[PDB]
Design a protein around this ligand. Structure first.
Ligand code: HEM
Ligand code: HEM
Ligand code: HEM
Ligand code: HEM
Lengths: 146, 141, 141, 146
C-alpha cells in the first residue's frame, strides 16, 4: 500500500469519532439489503428478506460490529494492511470463496455510512483517503486468491 | 424492477434535495474526479479544478437529467433515450464507470440528508441509479 | 442494444457454431471453473471433472439459451425472463460472474472459429454477451 | 507468487511460440475495437475511427509490440511481477490515470488472441495458467492505486 501521510492522518482521526456499535450493523445490514446476492454467505443468520428484517436481525448487527472492529484494528497499523488481513484472507478466500468485488462493495457501503454520520465533514478529499482504504482493505483480503 | 415503495422512496429522497440539486450533482462529480481520477479523462475540454464553473454547470445538467428520470420513473428508457445514445455511442463511456458516479451520488446524498438516507431508501436509490446506468449504457432496465 | 451490424455478425458467427453449441457451452463452463474457481461454489453437487456428463448437459442448456437469445435479439428481456428470475432470486449469482462466463465463451469461440473471429465480430459477440448478462442481472434492479 | 511450477512451464512454453509483433498489434488493436472507451487514452495515435483503421494503424501495432515485450520480459520472473511492473504502475496510475479494471481487459483480450492463434492447444488448463498471469499483471500494475 502507498498511503500518503495525509491519508493516514485522515483515516486515523475520523475513525476515533466513529460510533462502531452503530456503524457496524449499519454497514453489514446495508450491504445485505442493497446487494442481495451477498446473502448467500449468511444462510445461518435467519430472515434476511427485507430492510426491516435485516436491520432488526441480532446476528447481522453482532457480525457487523466484528467487521468494523477488524477495520479499527487494521487502522492501528496502516502500513501493514496485508499482514493484518492475512488470516482473514484465508477465511474469505480459501474457505468462503467470496468474490473480491464484494470486499470493495462492503467498503463502499462503509463509506456511505461514514457520510451519513459525518455529513459535511466527510469532504471529497476525506472521501478520497477512505476510498484508498477501501481499495487497500480489498487488496489485502484478496491476497490469498490470484 | 422498482417497487411501489422504491418509487415513493426515490421521489421523496430526491425531493429532499431542495434548491441544491445542481450543487449536489457538482459535488458528486467532484468526489468522483478525486477518488477515481480515470473518470477525468472523459472531460478533456473541461477545467476540472476544485470549484470549477464548468463542473458546476455540468452538475446542474446531471441533476436535471436525474430530476427528469425521477419524474418518469415508470418509463426510464424513454426519458433517457437521448442521453443513452450520447453516452453509449458518442462519448463511449466505460459501462463499469457508471458505478463510480452512482456511488459518489449516494455518498453526496448521505452527507446532506442523513435523516432521509435509511437502509430502505439507500436500497431504493441504489436500484434507481443502477437502472439509470443500464439504460444509459444499453437501453435496458 | 446491438446495432444492425452487430446483429448480422452475431447471427453469422453463432450460426457457424451450429451442432457444436452444446459442446462449446460445456467447454466454456470448464474454462470458467478452472480459471475462476470461486464459480464452482454455485454447483456444489455437480460433477465438475473434465469430460463431466453433468457439465456437458449443462453446457447444452446454456448454449440453447444463447441460441434463443440470438433468435430474439430485439426482445431479450422477454426471452430471458425466467432465467433472469432464476439467476438473481434463487441462485443469487454475483453479477461479476457473468463477465467471467462471457469471457470464457469468447475464448471458446476464438479457439474453434479463428478465421470467423475477426475484430469486428469479436466486438459484436462481446456486446451480445454483455447484453445477455445485463438482462440476466436485471432482477437485482 | 501463486504460480505453480506447472503454470510457469505453460506460460513460458506457449509464449515461446507466439509471434510477438503480430500478437502485440492484434491485442492492442482488439482492445481498442472491442472496448472503444479505451481509445480515449490514445489520442496521439492518429486514426482510430473504425475497426479497419485501428487494425491497420502502425502506431497501434508498434505500441502493442511494446506492451507484449514488457509481458514477455515479466514472464522471466513470474514470482516478482510487482517489482517488474513497479515503474509501469506509476506511469499508468499516476500519470495516465488508466482504470485499474482495464488492465484485466487487455489481459483478457490477450488471452483471446492466444486462443485464436493456438486453437485446441489452448486448453482450459492452459488458459487457467494464463489467467493467473492476467490477474498477477493487473494486480502489479494496479499497485499505485492504493
Ligand atoms: C472490508 C471487508 C470485510 C471485512 C473487514 C470482513 C471481516 C470479517 C471478520 C472480522 C469476520 C469474523 C472472523 C472471525 O470471527 O474470526 C468475518 C467473517 C465472515 N465474513 Fe467478512 N469481512 C469483509 C467482507 C466480507 C464480504 C463482502 C462478505 C460476503 C459477501 C463476507 C462474508 C463473511 C462471512 C460469511 C463470515 C463468517 C460468518 C459466520 O460466522 O458464519 N465478508 N469477516
Ligand atoms: C447517473 C448517471 C449519468 C447521468 C444522469 C448523466 C447525465 C449527463 C447529462 C445530462 C449530460 C449532458 C448532455 C448534454 O446536454 O450535452 C452528460 C454528458 C456527459 N457525461 Fe454523463 N451522465 C451519467 C453518467 C456519466 C458517467 C459515469 C460518465 C463518465 C465517467 C459520464 C461522462 C459524460 C461526458 C464526458 C459528457 C459530455 C460532457 C461535455 O462534453 O460537455 N456521464 N451526462
Ligand atoms: C451467458 C450467461 C448464462 C446463461 C445463458 C445461463 C443459462 C442457464 C440455464 C439455461 C440454466 C438452466 C436452468 C433452467 O433452464 O431452468 C442455468 C442454470 C444455472 N446457472 Fe446459468 N447461465 C448463465 C450464467 C451463469 C453464471 C455466470 C453462473 C454462476 C457463476 C450460473 C450459475 C447457474 C447455476 C448454479 C444453475 C443451476 C444448476 C443446477 O441445476 O443446480 N449461470 N443457467
Ligand atoms: C494490462 C497490461 C498492460 C501492460 C503490460 C502495458 C504496458 C505498457 C508499456 C510497456 C508501455 C510503454 C511505456 C513506456 O514506453 O515508457 C505502456 C504505455 C501506455 N499504456 Fe499501457 N499497458 C497495459 C495496459 C494498458 C491499458 C488497459 C491502457 C488503456 C486503456 C493503457 C494505456 C497506455 C498508454 C496511453 C501508454 C502511453 C502511450 C503513449 O506513449 O502515448 N495501458 N503500457
Amino acid at each position: 500500500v502507498h498511503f500518503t501521510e495525509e491519508d493516514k492522518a485522515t483515516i486515523t482521526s475520523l475513525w476515533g469519532k466513529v460510533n462502531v456499535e452503530d456503524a457496524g450493523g449499519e454497514t453489514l445490514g446495508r450491504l445485505l439489503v442493497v446487494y442481495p446476492w451477498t446473502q448467500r454467505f449468511f444462510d445461518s443468520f435467519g430472515n434476511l428478506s427485507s430492510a426491516s428484517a435485516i436491520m432488526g436481525n441480532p446476528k447481522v448487527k453482532a457480525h457487523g460490529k466484528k467487521v468494523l472492529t477488524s477495520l479499527g484494528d487494521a487502522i492501528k497499523h496502516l502500513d501493514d494492511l496485508k499482514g493484518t488481513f492475512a488470516q482473514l484472507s484465508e477465511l474469505h478466500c480459501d474457505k468462503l470463496h467470496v468474490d473480491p468485488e464484494n470486499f470493495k462493495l462492503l467498503g463502499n457501503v462503509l463509506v456511505t455510512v461514514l457520510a451519513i454520520h459525518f455529513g459535511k465533514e466527510f469532504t471529497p478529499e476525506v472521501q478520497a483517503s477512505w476510498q484508498k482504504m477501501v481499495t487497500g482493505v480489498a487488496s489485502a483480503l484478496s491476497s490469498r486468491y490470484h | 424492477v422498482l417497487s411501489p415503495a422504491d418509487k415513493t422512496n426515490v421521489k421523496a429522497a430526491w425531493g429532499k434535495v431542495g434548491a441544491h440539486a445542481g450543487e449536489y450533482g457538482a459535488e458528486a462529480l467532484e468526489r468522483m474526479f478525486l477518488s477515481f481520477p480515470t473518470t477525468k479523462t472523459y472531460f478533456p475540454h473541461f477545467d476540472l479544478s476544485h470549484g470549477s464553473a464548468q463542473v458546476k454547470g455540468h452538475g446542474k445538467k446531471v441533476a436535471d437529467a436525474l430530476t427528469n428520470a425521477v419524474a418518469h420513473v415508470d418509463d426510464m428508457p424513454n426519458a433517457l433515450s437521448a442521453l443513452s445514445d450520447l453516452h453509449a455511442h458518442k462519448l463511449r463511456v466505460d459501462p463499469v464507470n457508471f458505478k463510480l458516479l452512482s456511488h459518489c451520488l449516494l455518498v453526496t446524498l448521505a452527507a446532506h440528508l442523513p435523516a432521509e438516507f435509511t437502509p430502505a431508501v439507500h436500497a431504493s436509490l441504489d436500484k434507481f441509479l443502477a437502472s439509470v446506468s443500464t439504460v444509459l449504457t444499453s437501453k435496458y432496465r
